[PDB]
């Protein structure tokens, strides 16, 4: 489809790899008794492998010539969830962390010896500050417009 790739629900190397893995597991399964705990563990492993392959096929990925899925970070609308959808999420969480830390530092800048508050964290003020990062984009944008983000 894109860059000479094959849809993952149509390629044959995917099925061949699945068969190889299943046979490799079943070779070890035969050794033990069918009712024994290792048999149950190996059956669970086989079920997990089958579910993973089915999910990968149903999710609309694209295997390559050799048989493995390929990620597309290009920006096509059919792969929103491949890179772009997770990435934004990360930024959100990441921003949270940063924002919170910055706030805490300012919250201890007033006192005469902030080093004691840096090496021994206090829990009440930190817990007050932690949940303010849930709306970090709005506060950050307002501070940028006001001009309090950058020192002078």
């Amino acid at each position: 489809d894109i860059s000479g790739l094959t849809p993952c629900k149509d390629s044959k190397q995917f099925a061949k790899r699945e068969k190889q893995q299943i046979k490799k597991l079943e070779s070890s399964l035969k050794l033990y008794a069918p009712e024994s705990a290792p048999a149950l563990a190996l059956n669970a492993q086989i079920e997990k492998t089958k579910r993973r392959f089915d999910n990968y096929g149903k999710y609309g990925l694209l295997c390559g010539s050799d048989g493995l899925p390929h990620l597309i970070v290009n920006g096509d609308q059919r792969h929103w969830g491949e890179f772009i959808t997770p990435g934004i999420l990360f930024l959100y969480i990441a921003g949270w962390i940063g924002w919170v830390g910055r706030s805490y530092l300012i919250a201890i800048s007033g006192e005469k010896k902030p080093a004691m508050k840096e090496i021994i964290i206090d829990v009440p003020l930190a817990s007050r500050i932690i949940f303010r990062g849930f709306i970090w984009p709005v506060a950050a944008y307002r501070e940028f417009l006001n001009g309090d983000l950058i020192a002078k």
Binding site: S36, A37, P38, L40, A41, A44
Partner: peptide, 11 residues
């Protein structure tokens, strides 16, 4: 020996 191995996979 089977029970010892199963102790890890109880859940």
């Amino acid at each position: 020996s089977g029970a010892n191995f199963a102790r890890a996979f109880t859940v």
